[PDB]
């Protein structure tokens, strides 16, 4: 009923490779809120702006007991370099095979260049403590986004 998106059961058990060399799974986050933001490419202007915006708000996400994960299909090493350069204090998922991206349906197609071109569409999701996707943002406008996600989280968590 409150879900806005249904994920395959297996999604919650996918091993997600993180910056720093460990793995997580969505099921491992049971009991707390989780913000999952998808972005197209490490170390590009919009993606850097977005990551820095979330990073600045971490204490506010902490107040709600929430954790954040950023996701792109860049490698672990790329993610390590991006985190270190920018000072991010939350993890980045290296979704190299786009398994997590496909589960959230963020790989979108555009007819361009006389081709059918597939890519990550900037998108964010709020996952409840019981693993329901209760809010989505797609074709994300970076400016103001992290603030809006925090506000929505607070509204849902209260």
Q: Does 39 bind Na ion (CB under 5 A)?
A: no
Q: Does 27 bind Na ion (CB under 5 A)?
A: no
- List the interface residues with Na ion, window 59-118 (CB under 5 A): 82, 85
- List the interface residues with Cl ion, window 117-156 (CB under 5 A): 136
Q: Does 107 bind Cl ion (CB under 5 A)?
A: no
Nearer to Na ion, 29 or 122 (CB): 29
Q: How far apart are CA 155 and CA 48, in angstroms?
A: 26
Nearer to Cl ion, 64 or 136 (CB): 136
- Residue 18 DSSP one-character state: B
Residue nearest to Na ion (CB): 43
Angstrom CA distances, 29 to 13, 68, 145, stand at 11, 10, 23
Residue 62 zone, left/alpha/beta (φ > 0; ψ -120 to 50; rest): alpha
Residues 6 or more apart whose CB falls under 8 angstroms from that of 93 comprise 16, 17, 18, 24, 69, 70, 71, 72, 79, 100
Nearer to Cl ion, 82 or 104 (CB): 104
Catalytic residue among 47, 126, 149, 153: 47
Q: How far apart are CA 122 and CA 75, in angstroms?
A: 18
Q: Is 83 a catalytic residue?
A: no
Q: Which does 5 bind (CB under 5 to 8 A by kind): Cl ion, Na ion, none?
A: Cl ion
User: In DSSP terms, which residues pair with 37 in a beta bridge?
Assistant: 70, 124
Residue nearest to Cl ion (CB): 136
Binding site for Cl ion (CB under 5 A): 5, 136
Q: Please give the positions annotated as active site.
A: 47
């Amino acid at each position: 009923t409150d879900a806005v998106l249904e994920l395959p059961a297996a999604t919650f058990d996918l091993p997600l490779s993180l910056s720093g060399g460990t793995q997580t799974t969505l099921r491992a986050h049971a009991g707390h809120w989780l913000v999952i933001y998808f972005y197209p490419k490490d170390s590009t202007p919009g993606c850097t702006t977005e990551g820095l915006d979330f990073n600045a708000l971490l204490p506010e996400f902490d107040k709600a007991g929430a954790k954040i994960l950023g996701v792109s299909r860049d490698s672990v090493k790329s993610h390590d370099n991006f985190c270190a350069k920018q000072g991010f204090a939350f993890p980045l998922v290296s979704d190299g095979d786009e398994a997590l991206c496909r589960a959230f349906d963020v790989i979108k197609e555009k007819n361009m260049y006389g081709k059918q071109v597939l890519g990550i569409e900037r998108s964010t999701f709020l996952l409840s403590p019981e693993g329901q996707v209760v809010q989505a943002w797609r074709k994300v406008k970076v400016a103001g986004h992290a603030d809006a996600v925090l506000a929505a989280l607070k509204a849902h968590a209260k």
